[PDB]
Design a protein around this ligand. Structure first.
Ligand SMILES: CC(=O)N1C[C@H](Oc2ccccn2)[C@H]2C[C@@H]1CC[C@H]2O
Length: 282
């Protein structure tokens, strides 16, 4: 069955809610014992969103190695992603420590700092060249180098300095700024254009550490980004592009972080994204 006819039949049938609940029912359940330790309560944004112990990113410190972040490793596609929550006021230094230690080239942000009149993550990068940020708890300095503001996204060049060794690296910040406060975008054209801007940068390539991807919880919009990227890469690698099963790829990804794709509308949008992508990709 051709992906876009399961979708046209799910649409003809309006069964999106039924498909989505079948995924929720078959998803992996692994322990998250480190996330639930009392010493870590102020390191979690949402009580119901935690990294599994087996796939969690460890900070390189003896004090407390915990961050709300997971390694998604896709064996057949040969892609890895780190999915994390939007940083909290007390975890902005941990966030940049992780980017440093994992050798990431890119950070992908899919939310605004304020949405629906409430704060969805800390202001964790500098807004002016001449006002740099210092994270005293992790010994890092972060400077804004340049900013390119477009209609659907902004790309920033940042300089991260390890103050312990005086090594520096260039980090690219890819900020999708137009996801609506409610629901999903009507067309996937701008999100797809955005995905191909991150690829073109080198940030997803095996010469670097994994890309860091976040939204507010790091499971819904973040899940949509990695699911569309991996499905399109599998369609380019395999003999029969029609063999790629988006529901099976999503369940593989849910072995590494809980809750990826938060709504039936995010599942339909993911299908739409890979359909138009593949209409021009095979
Ligand atoms: C319809 C559309 O605009 N798309 C954008 C994108 O194509 C590229 C490739 C390289 C550089 C820029 N855009 C994606 C998804 C979809 C179709 C083909 C697929 O590669």
């Amino acid at each position: 069955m051709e992906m876009e006819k399961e979708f046209e039949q799910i649409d003809k049938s309006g069964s999106w809610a039924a498909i989505y609940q079948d995924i929720r029912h078959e998803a992996s359940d692994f322990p998250s014992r480190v996330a639930k330790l009392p010493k870590n309560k102020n390191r979690n944004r949402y009580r119901d969103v935690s990294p599994f112990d087996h796939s969690r990113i460890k900070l390189h410190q003896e004090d407390n190695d915990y961050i709300n972040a997971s390694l998604i490793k896709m064996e057949e596609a040969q892609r890895s992603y780190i999915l994390t929550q939007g940083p909290l006021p007390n975890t902005v230094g941990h966030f940049w420590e992780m980017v440093w230690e994992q050798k990431s080239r890119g950070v992908v942000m899919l939310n605004r700092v304020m949405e629906k009149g409430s704060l969805k993550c800390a202001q964790y990068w500098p807004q002016k060249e001449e006002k740099e940020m210092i994270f005293e708890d992790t010994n890092l300095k972060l400077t804004l180098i340049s900013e390119d503001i477009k209609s659907y996204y902004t790309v920033r060049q940042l300089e991260l300095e390890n103050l312990t060794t005086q090594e520096t690296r260039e980090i690219l910040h890819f900020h999708y700024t137009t996801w609506p406060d409610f629901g999903v975008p009507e067309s996937p054209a701008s999100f797809l254009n955005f995905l191909f801007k991150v690829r073109e940068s080198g940030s997803l390539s095996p010469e670097h550490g994994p890309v860091v991807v976040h939204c507010s919880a790091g499971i819904g919009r973040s899940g949509t980004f990695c699911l569309a990227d991996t499905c399109l890469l599998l369609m380019d690698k395999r003999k029969d592009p029609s063999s790629v099963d988006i529901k099976k790829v999503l369940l593989e990804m849910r072995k590494f972080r809980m809750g990826l794709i938060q709504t039936a509308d995010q599942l339909r949008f993911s299908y739409l994204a890979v359909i138009e992508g593949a209409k021009f990709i095979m």
